[PDB]
Amino acid sequence: DFYEMTSRTPIRAREAHIQMKAAALRGANNNLFGLDGNVGTTVENTERHTT
């Protein structure tokens, strides 16, 4: 799942490493944000009930 490429390494296997890396990814997005907390579907009324 993980490795660090270095300058002592062969040519061939690099191809499979990178191809199978990126192609093994798909669909999942950077898709930064979720949703926010301040969720008041309405505003306070600021009034009074009386008879």
Nearer to its own copies, 28 or 32 (CB): 28
Tell me how many degrees the CA angle 6-11-15 measures, rounded to the nearest 5.
95
Rule CB under 8 A: choose which of 15, 36, 37, 38 binds its own copies.
15
Query: What DSSP assignment string belongs to 5-38?
Result: --TT--SHHHHHHHHHHHHH--S---------S-
**Number of residues in contact with its own copies under rule CB under 8 A:** 10
The correct pick among 5, 11, 13, 20 for binding its own copies (CB under 8 A) is 20
- Binding to its own copies, residues 29-48 (CB under 8 A): 46-48
